[PDB]
Amino acid sequence: DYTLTRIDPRYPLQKQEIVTDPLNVFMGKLNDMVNWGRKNSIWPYNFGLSCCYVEMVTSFTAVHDVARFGAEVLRASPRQADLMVVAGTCFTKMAPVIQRLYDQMLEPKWVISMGACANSGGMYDIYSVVQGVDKFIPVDVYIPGCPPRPEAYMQALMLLQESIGKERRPLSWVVGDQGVYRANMQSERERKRGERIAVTNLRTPDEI
């Protein structure tokens, strides 16, 4: 129920294989402590592409307060950032810039596609748009929407936190196994199918 990824510099320059979860009880507790610290302090790269970035900085404001999750520092440097939110369209002139900024980020790093443009190109199936940011960089969380509302971005933040909290990474670069192990978690569609199909009645659209 895990995937093993090791990188060695077409993009992405990684190869993944399905592997059994390896997990002493002290090493496991240290791994959960490291994962807890990584998931409760996630610093996003302040990267503005399009309208989805306007919704992201709406999520950062007072009526939403994304600071409650410890994800508010909003670094302008990719070295100091933990999370790349592709919040906008992957234009062909901007795609090498996105690749360069993602390369300049440091491990551990995670990617959230925010919006239909970053997911698959969205409505812009046009000559000057890369059809999704997963064509050239690996994505951890996808948010459908055009735009997603700010609480959808927070929901993806919680999904990323839950994905980090059960993934395995080396504690030190001199001791252990240096490959990155990511959990193959259950899809949210199959998890929410029980509560979504049973919905019967909704409020009529003629009211407030």
Partner: protein, 586 residues
């Protein structure tokens, strides 16, 4: 006579003046639904006509638009000169409150026009875009390089034989050699951009990743110490191909793409497109539709102005009004979600009306917003806008007069801070804006950053007044016109009448058939003047969709106004323009 009727405008005094000056056989008058006199001028007389219009007793002082059209696939070209391509020039005389559209016909092999930059400096970027997207060469241009697409691009995207969709092309593969080659193309070289370089002129790179809400873009700066001796903006990093999608989507299905032209505008962006399509369809919307569209336009205008003022204050250095202004944006978003069901891109305007009726309880939410807003605005002024540090950062920074605003096509608050009282809602009224009592604020004559910001505050207050008038006087009636081309028809008649079901079936599947004509609508957007110029060839898709945006003009006006200033002055000027890069590139 309805306002959508086809007119040749032979009663315009400019037509008689051109008859007396150049002769009757020199040009062809075209009857359109654009509302403007369209004159097909021969190519060798184009600069003469431009000089004559610039030297009129009430001169045509502003080049509103300049672009091209591929006429090869156009079947209904009756009463028109023979052409494979054409170049159109939209020129505005503010003193007459009139405008004229010159058109130059071009063959497929001889695709060269004399340049228009000696008369209007905005023709630089307009002709660069026309060369980039249509391949039309302009003789005498200082630098005719691509402005939207990279320099290593093959073909011109807006030609009719160029495939539109990315799925037509190969999927995007990023290899090591491809990444190196595209990173080499984005590198700046002083000689190619016409910098015209002293052993001290350093070069500065601003973008293309941009820590602000208004898009991602580059500015390359030539510096003597800290002084900006020259600069040229690099745009096209936000190009979405929206006009090519206008040729690719039907009339009804293009409205979501019209939403994302200026993504802080929403229904303000939807308004000129649906007005131009209703001109093409011969649809006069009822008064309730006009009041609803005015109300939503003013709501989104207050949203955009709140974001602009908050972003300007944040760029000065005070970071709290962005939190409070986004709370006010959340109140506006509550009302907009209640009415349309979406926050930023409602796509709620329709050909002939709006998608739904107003929900029960809209007046309550509008009342809460109208009670909430003015105290918050006064707190914004007292906390940040009257701060002397903000005034020192803003007043006197990147200032220009009426002549520089007129020659560069600057509209909106930047034009009106020069003292020129020119708002579309009062000069060329649209969508029943003549029934609303509101004032147009103007400046003293100098367009500082602070003057533009205070003007946008004043238009926020006037939009609050318009919203109060909309709340007090909303007519009872239909939310959709009774025209046969109202797309889509009212939903319940579609659900129980077979003829209405047929109309809806054909309008949402194949599209509604607009008769072959040309239409034009310009509106006062949240950031200036936004216009749609729509050419229909009689089909269910647009033959040509031309979207004129003011942010293009303001980004082109940047090097003339920021020259000889500091880099922080450039940051303040960027924060005080009220642009977005989707508006620039689209």
């Amino acid at each position: 006579e309805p306002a959508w009727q086809t007119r040749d405008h032979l009663d315009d005094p400019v037509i008689g003046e051109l008859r007396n000056r150049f002769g009757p056989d020199a040009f062809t008058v075209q009857a359109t639904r654009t509302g403007v006199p369209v004159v097909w001028i021969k190519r060798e007389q184009l600069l003469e006509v431009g000089d004559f219009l610039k030297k009129l007793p009430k001169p045509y002082v502003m080049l509103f638009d300049l672009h091209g059209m591929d006429e090869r696939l156009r079947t209904h070209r009756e009463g028109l000169p023979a052409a494979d391509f054409s170049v159109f020039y939209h020129l505005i005389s503010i003193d007459r409150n009139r405008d004229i559209m010159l058109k130059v016909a071009l063959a497929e092999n001889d695709l060269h026009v004399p340049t228009f930059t000696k008369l209007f400096p905005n023709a630089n970027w307009y002709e660069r875009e026309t060369w980039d997207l249509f391949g039309i060469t302009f003789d005498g241009h200082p630098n005719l390089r691509r402005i939207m697409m990279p320099q290593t691009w093959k073909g011109h995207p807006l030609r009719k034989d160029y495939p539109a969709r990315a799925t037509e092309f190969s999927p995007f593969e990023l290899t090591k050699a491809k990444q190196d080659l595209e990173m080499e193309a984005l590198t700046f070289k002083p000689e190619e951009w016409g910098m015209k370089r002293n052993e001290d002129f350093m070069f500065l790179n601003l973008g293309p990743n941009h820590p602000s809400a208004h898009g991602a873009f580059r500015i390359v700066l030539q510096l003597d110490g800290e002084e900006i001796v020259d600069c040229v903006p690099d745009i096209g990093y936000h190009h979405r191909g929206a006009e090519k999608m206008g040729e690719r989507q039907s009339w009804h299905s293009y409205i979501p793409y019209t939403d994302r032209i200026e993504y802080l505008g929403g229904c303000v962006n939807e308004m000129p497109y649906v007005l131009a399509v209703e001109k093409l369809a011969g649809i006069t919307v009822p008064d309730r539709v006009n009041v609803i569209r005015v109300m939503l336009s003013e709501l989104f205008r207050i949203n955009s102005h709140l974001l602009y003022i908050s972003t300007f204050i944040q760029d000065v250095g005070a970071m709290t009004p962005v939190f409070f202004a986004f709370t006010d944006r959340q109140k506006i978003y509550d009302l907009v979600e209640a009415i349309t069901g979406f926050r930023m891109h409602p796509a709620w305007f329709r050909i002939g009306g709006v998608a739904h009726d107003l929900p029960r309880g809209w007046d309550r939410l509008l009342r809460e917003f109208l009670d909430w807003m003015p105290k918050r605005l006064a707190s914004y002024e007292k906390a940040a806008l009257q701060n002397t540090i903000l005034k020192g950062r803003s007043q006197g920074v990147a200032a220009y007069g009426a002549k520089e605003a007129l020659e560069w096509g600057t509209t909106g608050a930047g034009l009106r801070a020069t003292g020129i009282d020119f708002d579309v809602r009062k000069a060329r009224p649209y969508s029943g804006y003549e029934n609303f009592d509101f004032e147009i604020p103007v400046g003293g004559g100098v367009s500082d950053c602070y003057t533009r910001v205070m003007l946008k505050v004043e238009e926020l207050r006037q939009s609050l007044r318009i919203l109060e008038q909309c709340l007090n006087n909303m007519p009872e009636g239909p939310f959709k016109a009774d025209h046969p081309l109202t797309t889509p028809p009212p939903k319940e008649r579609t659900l129980q009448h077979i003829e209405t079901l047929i109309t809806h079936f054909l309008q949402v599947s194949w599209g509604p058939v607009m008769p072959a004509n040309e239409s034009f609508q310009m509106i006062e957007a949240t950031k200036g003047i936004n216009s749609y110029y729509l050419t229909s060839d009689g089909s269910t898709m647009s033959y040509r969709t031309r979207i004129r945006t003011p942010s293009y003009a303001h980004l082109q006006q940047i090097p003339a106004a920021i020259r000889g200033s500091l880099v922080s002055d450039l940051i303040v000027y960027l924060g005080s323009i009220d642009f977005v890069m989707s508006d620039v590139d689209r």
